[PDB]
Amino acid sequence: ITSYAVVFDAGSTGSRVHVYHFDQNLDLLHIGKDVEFYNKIQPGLSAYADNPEQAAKSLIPLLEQAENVVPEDFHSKTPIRLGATAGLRLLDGDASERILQAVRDMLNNKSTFNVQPDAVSIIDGTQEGSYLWVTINYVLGNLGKRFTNTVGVIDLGGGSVQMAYAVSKKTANAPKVEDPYIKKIVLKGKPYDLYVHSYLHFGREASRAEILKVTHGSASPCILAGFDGIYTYSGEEFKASAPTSGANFDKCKKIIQKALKLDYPCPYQNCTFGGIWNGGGGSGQKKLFAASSFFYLPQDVGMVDPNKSNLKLRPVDLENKAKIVCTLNVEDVKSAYPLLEKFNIVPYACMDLIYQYELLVDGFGLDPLQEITAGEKIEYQEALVDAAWALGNAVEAVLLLPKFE
Template identity: 35%
Template sequence: MGSMSDERESSAASAPVLPEHVHLSPTTHETRMGYLSPNSLEMRNSRTAVYRRVSLLLLMAAVHYFLVSDWRRRPGWQPDGAPIRGSAGIRKVGEVCHVDATGKEERIRNRHAIIFDAGSTGSRVHVYEFQFCGSKLNVLVDEVFEEVKPGLSHYHADPLQAAKSLKPLLDSAVARVPPDTRKCTPLVVKATAGLRLLPEYSVTGILQNVREFIKTHPFLLGDGKLSHSEAVAVMDGSEEGVFAWVTVNFLQDKLRPGFTSMPFLPDETSVVMDLGGGSTQIVFAIARDGYADIDPLKHPQYYYRLALHGNQVDLYQQSYLGYGLMEARKNIKLAHIQKMLADSSDGRALRFPCYTKGHKEDVDKSGKMFALTGDSSGWDACLNVVRPVFRKEDPCLVHPCSFNGIHQPAIRTKNLIAFSYFFDRLIPL
């Protein structure tokens, strides 16, 4: 299982020799988005600036803000108009891009949106620059990304310091957004599994301090309609997965303004799998006529009906809190310590078959430190340690199930996008 420390930097910088079926494009960014093809196990970075830097959580929120939220119903929004894409690409600001039947001209303009992704291992800011033709989304022009570590949850005992940890990120946003548009540039902060795992009183203190700290900076907290408590909040696990699905499929041109003119084909969209530090998400579209034995509306804990550009899209979604890479590692070690203590009373060293022989690590269990020592017992011994944590024997109340008694229907699409730690862990293979 290795160390519980965040290993993204070491894996990104190690530059391993890759097998022929694994392809990576050059990038200067630390975290990369990978594509996993089930047929060829092909992994590659994106070829455009949109994909270059994806911790990915919250381009999803920016896309949701511009494409899904109430903002789209403001005057001038044309939900059925096709975006200016393809050969048109990025246009010159101020250029006439459309003339309606009355002769009214619409011009190219750029807008920014600032998204803070407060993850379990670090906080990141994404400053997105979008281009519009009038009020119609054209293209994502650019993204600025910065990250600080540790994440907000690290400061659970000092909420003011949690807020101050975001200062370098806010400074980067100020430097990027033109002074004359800062006051109307929306900013939201969405926290994920790191804060979902904390007690409510700790979360409340951190979020309140973050809100007050951001108010000292020249941005629009929220979008003018969101309350400040909504603009700085913990994202529900289902939202996290759904926004990721929207983002990935939007970037693949499978969702776009105007796609109401075409039939929506769920099997042509991509499954999204996000392995974070504290939780794991899986989301995919389902065809209503293909799951006759399942009524999504009767199982809202598993299904999400998304209204997008006039379409109703049924998504299967599940967020496995506690099954992110770091949290799962911790839980596996703690479960093993508990079992070893129950099986032994002679005080011998606690051996851990998932470590290499001789590797040692101190693990905190309820304020008491235990030393785990690797003994190289092999794959089967390690699997026997890991398997109970996934509770495959739990009752399945809504068939079929994956683990922990969690319902999951069959995946029928051939397109699978796996990112975050899925990508990082597969690079050295």
């Protein structure tokens, strides 16, 4: 009548386990007082790059907990899965493939759960965006509805940004091309054609390096007064110093437009930036959930009500915020916004706000008055679910079971 599913998320600093229990209608059942069992260990698999067998061993305590959570009669038919992050790739040689294989071996040797051939993998950009689309539209109860009533998702990660939303069977006329542009997925028996794209270099951290490259060795009006230093990304140094008059919303906005490559010639019917096909827009993209750094930034500059994990905002709200912050210096911003000081990113306050505004409006063609939801978590019943890939991955796994088909 019910099913469990176990999903590990192996991140750069830690590993996490998620256990879910789905009832016969594919609604989550509570486990204790939450809608999942969740626990984390540290460090991550990459701390063990030189010793694959130990990277797998790191996970065993999490595994044993998930084995205790799932009642023994359900173990054989419970799918277990691990998805590793961005950075694991950033390991030397085939350190990363050796780690993934040591994990498969450990799961097959030490777990009683159902290990499928595709159980352990790296979740690339478009896969992540597709899974988040499932996480979010599962939570909101949209799976099985016509694409036009689903919610598109945008995820501003560290290195990349993803956009994913559902389109018509016609639109899916999609150019040939690199990550393909359409991901076909059936959920609750309904086929969706999902437009998906991941933009390398345009995540929150990576974007600062694109921006500071435009001004090469010179001062940048995207940097606040009172900072005169260096930004390092992927081992490259980028001079980050304010001009003598400090940050300037206007000039920084122009630099950002340049950095986005808004003027890159469009080989398709329409484009966002960098020559990327926009997927055609339409109903599937009319309501939106923006995750990760689209929430962290508002959170850090006092836009989110205390102890909330999402908010409603219009892109103009980011622009209005930058208009003020871009007149402030580092001491002002540090004192106003301690979270930015925690994350060592005070100097970039003005840049990060213009970037998000420009990315949403000039880049993705959102109306600057259209409300969207930004969040790190989404409401499900009384609880909060991570606005990330794990749940959507579990949902997909379970929908493959002959019981739930």
